[PDB]
UniProtKB/Swiss-Prot annotation:
Changing residue 139 to H: Impaired activity. It comes from Homo sapiens. SMART domains: Carb_anhydrase. The lineage of its organism: Eukaryota, Metazoa, Chordata, Craniata, Vertebrata. PROSITE patterns: ALPHA_CA_1, ALPHA_CA_2. Changing residue 61 to A: Reduced CO(2) hydrase activity, rescued by 4-methylimidazole (4-MI). Reduced proton transfer. Enhanced proton transfer. Enhanced proton transfer capacity. The gene is CA2. This is Carbonic anhydrase 2. Zinc. Can also use cobalt(II) with lower efficiency, but not copper(II), nickel(II) and manganese(II). The keyword Chaperone does not apply.
Length: 257
């Protein structure tokens, strides 16, 4: 149905998903001068010691690294959140070239890519119930810039040749998502939405200020994936990002001065 092309891309999504033009859509531009430091925000708690990765899937839009979320093994708490959010998957958005790819922007700056660690509020029992609630998800967003390689990303890039096309998956056990984090957990936070259909308005966004660096070779390998299925005309999986949406009646808070 939807995708990232001229005929089925973000400017078309509202026809099937009218909430695309809602009051709390993501991503947004983060204006660093306007975001207010909120000394009442807590440090984030990222508890991934017990994370259990299982599988990696090309879903025709991005690739998802999936976790066992059947118990509290990898959780996000604290920061602007009440309660416990279980890691279910992470994925990335990236560009055809290094000057674009991120969904959030910072003073209109686009990064080469953006990692989203998606977590759901355990008070709602399962992910499908959580996405129906305004506090159902917390997505931790991390920007990628191109420079030095990120050692903890190389196991993901190494497997991508085995999931080149839509619907392919590969065993992906024992991957430690702690190796994707930057040093600082300073962040911005605001209420928003999933950035792909169904675009539901159920996310507390937590976007880290410090980007991680990845190498040119690492991001080149992302761009060799395919949106299409096996044997279909090749369409490189590039520019799978939604542009910034109107901020409307929202405030972006900073955890840091
Ligand atoms: N790009 S995202 O907002 O992190 C996101 N996670 C998602 C999980 C399921 C369906 C749509 C999604 N969109
Ligand atoms: Zn995403």
């Amino acid at each position: 149905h939807w995708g990232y092309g001229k005929h089925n891309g973000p400017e078309h999504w509202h026809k099937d998903f009218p909430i695309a033009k809602g009051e709390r859509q993501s991503p947004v531009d983060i204006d660093t001068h306007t975001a207010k430091y909120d000394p009442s925000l807590k440090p984030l708690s990222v508890s991934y010691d017990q994370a259990t990765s299982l599988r990696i899937l090309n879903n025709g839009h991005a690739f998802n690294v999936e976790f066992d979320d059947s118990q509290d093994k990898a959780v996000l708490k604290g920061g602007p959140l009440d309660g416990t959010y279980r890691l279910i998957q992470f994925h990335f958005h990236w560009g055809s070239l290094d000057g674009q790819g991120s969904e959030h922007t910072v003073d209109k700056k686009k990064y080469a890519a953006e990692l989203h660690l998606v977590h759901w509020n355990t008070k709602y029992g399962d992910f499908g119930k959580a996405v129906q609630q305004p506090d159902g998800l917390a997505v931790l967003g991390i920007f990628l810039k191109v420079g030095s390689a990120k050692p903890g990303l190389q196991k993901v890039v190494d497997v991508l040749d085995s999931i080149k096309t839509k619907g392919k998956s590969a065993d992906f056990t024992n991957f430690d998502p702690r190796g994707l984090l930057p040093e600082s957990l300073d962040y911005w936070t605001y209420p928003g939405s999933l950035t792909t259909p169904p675009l539901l308005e159920c996310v507390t966004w937590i976007v880290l200020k410090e980007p991680i660096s990845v190498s040119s070779e690492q991001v080149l390998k992302f761009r060799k994936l395919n949106f299409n299925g096996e044997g279909e005309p090749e369409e490189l999986m590039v520019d799978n990002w939604r542009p910034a949406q109107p901020l409307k009646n929202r405030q972006i808070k900073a955890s840091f001065k």
